C-alpha cells in the first residue's frame, strides 16, 4: 500500500494530488511505482543550490555545469536581492527530496537533479548551445524557464549554435532516442504576446508548456499560441494557491509563480514517464502528452475539437498533464515510426496582403514518395512577408480536417516594420490528422489603418508518419 509523503509542506502541494480532481494526478503515478528513480533532469537557469537540504540527496554533478563562469559548480551567486533563486525554485519542483521533514516534494522525488548556471551573465548563442548540449548521454530531460523578452513586440528564436544543439540533442542525445527539452511558454499575457513569436517554444524539438490557475482559468501572464502542447498548474490571483518548492538560502517557499513554475512540473511528470519506459523517443513523449492530457474544467473561450476528436486550445494545448495516465500508457507504448518531412512550397508568385489575403492550396502530402505523411505531428507555415506594422496582422491556418490554428494573433505593441523572414509558425493542433487535402492560410489586417505589405514565400512543412493511427476520440 503506497504511503504518500510526510513532508511538512506536502499538504500545501494542491497541484500534485487531492480528493478534488484539480491536480496533475501525480500520486497515481507514485502509487504505480514511479518516482523518478534513475532519471536525470537538468535545470538550465541561474544556478542550483546543490547543498539545499531538500535537493542535496538528489543532486547530480553530472547534470550540472556553470557556463557563465566556466566551472563545474552551478552554485548560485548570492546577492541581497536574492536574484539568483529562480533555478533553485525550479529544481525543487522536479526533484525535491521526499519524506525528509523538509519543505515539500518534487514530482519525481527520487530522480537525479542538476542545474546549468547560464542566465547569470550575457546569454549568448554559444552559452545557450553549451547548456542545451551538456552531457547529452547522461542528462535525459532539460527544463528551461526562460526565453526571449515578453514585451509583445519581439520575434526571436535560437540562433545557429542553439538550433544545432537542439538537432544534435534530439538526434544523437539519450543514446539516439533524443534529448527531451521542456520549455515554459512565456509570461507575456499582459502584453498580448504570442508564444509563436518565440522560436524556443515554437520549436518542434521542445515541449512548450502553458499554465492554469488553481480555479482552472487562464492566468494573467499566459500567452496563447498554436505551438503550445499542454499545461500544468501554476499561480493565478491572490485567492488561488501557488507552487511550493525549495528556495535560495536553504529555505522553503509557497509562492513560486508564473510560467516559470509550469515547465518544471512537466519535466517531473516526463521523468516519471521515462522511468516507466526508458526506450521512449523524444517524439514518443510528445505523442504521450497529446493522447493523455486532459481539457476537463480548464476554462477558455477557444476550445475546439480537431479532426481526430481531441479538444485543443491556444491557451492550454491539449490540456492538463495527467501523470498517472502518462506512466500507464508509456509502459506498453510502441515506438513511433521514423519521422518523415514533406516540404510544400505553396506560392507561385508574391501576393499583396492588403486588408485580407487568403491562400488556398490542395496538397498530396508527398503521396507516392518515402516522405508520404498520412499521420501529422507538427505542421509549420514558414512565412516570408513584408508589412508596415507587424502587430496589426492576424494569421490563421486551416487544415484539411477543418482545424483552424491561430498562427499569430494581433500584438498591439508590435510596431515593427521588419515583417517575418522565413518564420516557421508551428501548430500542434492537427496532430494525428491526415494532412492530404486543402490547406488555407489567412492573413488579415486587424486594424483600421491602411497597412500594406506582400507575402513572398509560404512553405508548408509537414512532419509525421504513415502508420499507426488510433480510432479518433
Amino acid at each position: 500500500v503506497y504511503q504518500e509523503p510526510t513532508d511538512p509542506k506536502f499538504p500545501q502541494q494542491w497541484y500534485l494530488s487531492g480528493v478534488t480532481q484539480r491536480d496533475l494526478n501525480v500520486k497515481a503515478a507514485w502509487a504505480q511505482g514511479y518516482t523518478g528513480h534513475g532519471i536525470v533532469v537538468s535545470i538550465l537557469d541561474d544556478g542550483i543550490e546543490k547543498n539545499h537540504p531538500d535537493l542535496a540527496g538528489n543532486y547530480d554533478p553530472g547534470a550540472s555545469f556553470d557556463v557563465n563562469d566556466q566551472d563545474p559548480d552551478p552554485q548560485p551567486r548570492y546577492t541581497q536581492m536574492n536574484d539568483n533563486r529562480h533555478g533553485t525554485r525550479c529544481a525543487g519542483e522536479v526533484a525535491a527530496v521526499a519524506n525528509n521533514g523538509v519543505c515539500g516534494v518534487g514530482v519525481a522525488y527520487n530522480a537525479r537533479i542538476g542545474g546549468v548556471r547560464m542566465l547569470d551573465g550575457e546569454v549568448t548563442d554559444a552559452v545557450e548551445a553549451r547548456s542545451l548540449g551538456l552531457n547529452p548521454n547522461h542528462i535525459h530531460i532539460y527544463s528551461a524557464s526562460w526565453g526571449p523578452e515578453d514585451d509583445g513586440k519581439t520575434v526571436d528564436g535560437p540562433a545557429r549554435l542553439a538550433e544545432e544543439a537542439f538537432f544534435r540533442g534530439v538526434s544523437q542525445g539519450r543514446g539516439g532516442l533524443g534529448s527531451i527539452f521542456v520549455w515554459a511558454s512565456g509570461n507575456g499575457g499582459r502584453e498580448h504576446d504570442s508564444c509563436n513569436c518565440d522560436g524556443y517554444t515554437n520549436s518542434i524539438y521542445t515541449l512548450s508548456i502553458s499554465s492554469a490557475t488553481q480555479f482552472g482559468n487562464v492566468p494573467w501572464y499566459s500567452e496563447a499560441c498554436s505551438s503550445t502542447l499542454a499545461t500544468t498548474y501554476s499561480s493565478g490571483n491572490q485567492n488561488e494557491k501557488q507552487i511550493v518548492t525549495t528556495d535560495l538560502r536553504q529555505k522553503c517557499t509557497e509562492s513560486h509563480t508564473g510560467t516559470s513554475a509550469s515547465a518544471p512540473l512537466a519535466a517531473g511528470i516526463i521523468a516519471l514517464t521515462l522511468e516507466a519506459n526508458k526506450n521512449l523517443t523524444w517524439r514518443d513523449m510528445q505523442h504521450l502528452v497529446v493522447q493523455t492530457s486532459k481539457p476537463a474544467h480548464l476554462n477558455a473561450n477557444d476550445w475546439a475539437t480537431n479532426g481526430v476528436g481531441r479538444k485543443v486550445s491556444h491557451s492550454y494545448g491539449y490540456g492538463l498533464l495527467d501523470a498517472g495516465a502518462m506512466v500507464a500508457l508509456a509502459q506498453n507504448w510502441t515506438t513511433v515510426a521514423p519521422q518523415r518531412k514533406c516540404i510544400i512550397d505553396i506560392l507561385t508568385e508574391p501576393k499583396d496582403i492588403g486588408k485580407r489575403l487568403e491562400v488556398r492550396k490542395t496538397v498530396t502530402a508527398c503521396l507516392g514518395e518515402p516522405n508520404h505523411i498520412t499521420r501529422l505531428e507538427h505542421a509549420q507555415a514558414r512565412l516570408t512577408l513584408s508589412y508596415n506594422r507587424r502587430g496589426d496582422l492576424a494569421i490563421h491556418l486551416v487544415s484539411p480536417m477543418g482545424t483552424r490554428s491561430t498562427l499569430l494573433a494581433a500584438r498591439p505593441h508590435d510596431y515593427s516594420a521588419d515583417g517575418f523572414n522565413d518564420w516557421a509558425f508551428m501548430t500542434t493542433h492537427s496532430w494525428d490528422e491526415d494532412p492530404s487535402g486543402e490547406w488555407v492560410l489567412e492573413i488579415e489586417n486587424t486594424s483600421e489603418a491602411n497597412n500594406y505589405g506582400t507575402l513572398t514565400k509560404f512553405t508548408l512543412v509537414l512532419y509525421g508518419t504513415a502508420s499507426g493511427s488510433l480510432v479518433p476520440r
Partner: peptide
C-alpha cells in the same frame, strides 16, 4: 536578451 533572455529573461527569466
Amino acid at each position: 536578451x533572455x529573461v527569466k
